[PDB]
Structure formats: C-alpha cells, structure tokens
Write a protein that binds this ligand. Structure first.
Ligand SMILES: CN[C@H]1[C@H]2O[C@@](C[C@H](N)C(=O)O)(C(=O)O)C[C@H]2OC[C@H]1O
Length: 256
C-alpha cells in the first residue's frame, strides 16, 4: 500500500480544532475543521491515507538571524512531513524553500481591535501612542512587517521588534485575549478576523486589507505530490467544494 503521508498542521480555528466528544478520540479523529475536510477531499482524489501531526514548536514558520527556519516550514524543509495542510500563507520567501500548491483560499492582513476608537487604518495605528500592537510570532504577518519597505510598516516593525518580548504573541488566542483585556491591536489575516468578529461582538476589523495573498498546501521542494495536490485543489475550486467548505466552517451566528 501507498505509504501513509505525514501531515504537519497547527491548531487554528476554524481550520484545525480539537473535536469535542464525551468519548475517547484517537489519531486523526481528534481533529476537525476546514483543513481536515480539505484533507478528506484531497486524499480521496490522490488515493492516500494520512497521519495528522501538530507541529512540535507550535509555529507556522519564519527565519532567524542565521536564516534557519522553524515551524511547519522547517518540518517540510527537513522532510519530517510530506504535506503541510494548514492556513499556510504563500509568500515569496517561503516559495524559495518549499513547493506550495496553488491557493485554496485568499486573504489579506488587516487589524483586529475592540470597538470605539477613531483608529481607521494602519497609518492611524502607527501614528497614535495610546494603543500598542503586534502579531503572532514567526508567521507570515510578522514577516510581512519585518520585510516591508513601506514607511508606515517599517515603523510598525521597529515598534513590534522593540517590544517583541512583549508585542509578539505565541498564537491567535493569546493575541485575541490581549486585544480583549489590554490596549493592544492584533495584526491578523482577514479570514481569521471574519471568523472571530462574527462570534465576539466586542471585536472589529480596523481598516481594509493591506495586502492580498493565498493559503496553499506546503510540500518539500521536489515533492511528487505538489502538482497532484494543485490539480485536486483546482478540481475542488471548480466544483464549488471549497466555497461550500468555507461556508460550513465560517457560518453562524452573527454580530451587527
Ligand atoms: C490563520 N490566520 C491566523 C494565523 O495566521 C498567521 C500564520 C500565517 N497564516 C502563516 O502562514 O504564517 C499569521 O501570520 O497571520 C499566524 C496567526 O495569526 C493570526 C491569524 O492571522
């Protein structure tokens, strides 16, 4: 039989979440979400079973000072996993080191905060000094700021980096808790903002999207699966299945 593919992923609502049960769940049955439905579809089309493994360091992946990678990206580079199926942002810097599928969902960076301020844009946010801000550490949002040559965003990076110990959070939940309980705004992908702001009516998006990109399935460079995964994603896109999956996991219940 075809070797069971190792899938690296990360907990992130509503892409990958622990299933709630009153009885024991083992292996892949512990997980549900958009990316799990995507895996069920892709695996049917390509003819494999898989083993879902949460990335040990709990990171999406960025480079350090020395150019060493971490997170899911490192798992692919080091051939620890066959596929990364997660909301993994397709970027120039990553595409040089792994082979991404074509995108299955689009997004852009925006701002998550509480309601009631006159802050209306990243320009406003960088200018004012009342509210701090940051991003999840070692993801594409952090890296976007780190690499930007746009003045406002260069300033924002310098700020995040200066108070990194503090401004950069471990994961979305730490970020969201910081937004709810302190004067802090989170730079966050629009897909995730849409999800949270329809569930917690104290939260809102600030401004529009500051970039435009997509999520893809990651594979190691040279992977014999990447092109087949791309073909399967296009099939699912054309058949309307990706749209249906988004509606399934983003639906309910609502805020004004
Ligand atoms: C899937 N989106 C969420 C997550 O996306 C990340 C990871 C990113 N999607 C990546 O592939 O590195 C980000 O950097 O915005 C980390 C975390 O941040 C909050 C929110 O944007």
């Amino acid at each position: 039989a075809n070797r069971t593919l190792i899938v690296t992923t990360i907990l992130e609502e509503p892409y990958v979440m622990y299933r709630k049960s009153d009885k024991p769940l083992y292996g892949n049955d512990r997980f549900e979400g958009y990316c799990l439905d995507l895996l069920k579809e892709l695996s049917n089309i390509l003819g494999f079973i898989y083993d879902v493994k949460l990335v040990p360091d709990g990171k999406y992946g960025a480079q350090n000072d020395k150019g060493e990678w971490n997170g899911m990206v490192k798992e692919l580079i080091d051939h620890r996993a066959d596929l990364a199926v997660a909301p993994l942002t397709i970027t120039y810097v990553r595409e040089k080191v792994i082979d991404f599928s074509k995108p299955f969902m689009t997004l852009g960076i925006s701002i998550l905060y509480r309601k009631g301020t006159p802050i209306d844009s990243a320009d406003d946010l960088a200018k004012q000094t009342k509210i701090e801000y940051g991003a999840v550490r070692d993801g594409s949002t952090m890296t976007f700021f780190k690499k930007s040559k746009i003045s406002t965003y260069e300033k924002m990076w310098a700020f995040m980096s200066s108070r990194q110990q503090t401004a950069l959070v471990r994961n979305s939940d730490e970020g969201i808790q910081r937004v709810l309980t302190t004067d802090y705004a989170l730079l966050m992908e629009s897909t995730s903002i849409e999800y949270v702001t329809q569930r917690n009516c104290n939260l809102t998006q600030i401004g529009g999207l500051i970039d435009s990109k997509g999520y893809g399935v990651g594979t190691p460079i040279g992977s014999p699966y990447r092109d087949k995964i791309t073909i399967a994603i296009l099939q699912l896109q054309e058949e309307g299945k990706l749209h249906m999956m988004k509606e399934k996991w983003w639906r309910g219940n609502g805020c004004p």
